[PDB]
């Protein structure tokens, strides 16, 4: 009982955290490129 039910816990923890790992990359890589766009935009302002 405790063998197979605890063996799947590693995979459960892996998948339910891989679901968040990519959400973080979704958020972290979009709040950073917007800064690049704003900077290019400001440089266009200077001219």
């Amino acid at each position: 009982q405790r063998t197979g039910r605890s063996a799947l816990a590693v995979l459960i923890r892996a998948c339910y955290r891989l679901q968040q790992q990519l959400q973080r990359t979704r958020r972290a890589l979009l709040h950073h490129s917007d800064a690049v766009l704003t900077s290019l935009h400001h440089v266009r302002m200077l001219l």
């Binding site: 998948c15 959400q23 440089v43 266009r44």
Partner: protein
């Protein structure tokens, strides 16, 4: 018919202007080999070139938020 006076156009008709003592020492007759007026024309053109290069670079870099979405979503649905 018609009448008017006349003056003969002889080669001896000369003219005598007066020159100021400081007339020839002008900053315009005396020009160096390289003036800044040309430098203005070069620098303005370079600035205008950079201006259009900025728009080219902006349209190049507008894909950075786009390239990230489609590289993560098909793996997010893969995990889920």
């Amino acid at each position: 018919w018609e009448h008017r006076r006349f003056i003969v156009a002889d080669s001896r008709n000369f003219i005598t202007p007066e020159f100021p003592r400081d007339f020839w020492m002008s900053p315009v007759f005396n020009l160096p080999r390289e003036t800044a007026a040309e430098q203005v024309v070069v620098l303005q053109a370079q600035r205008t070139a950079a201006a259009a290069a900025l728009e080219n670079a902006a349209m190049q870099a507008a894909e950075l938020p786009v390239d990230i979405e489609r590289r993560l979503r098909p793996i997010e649905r893969n995990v889920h």
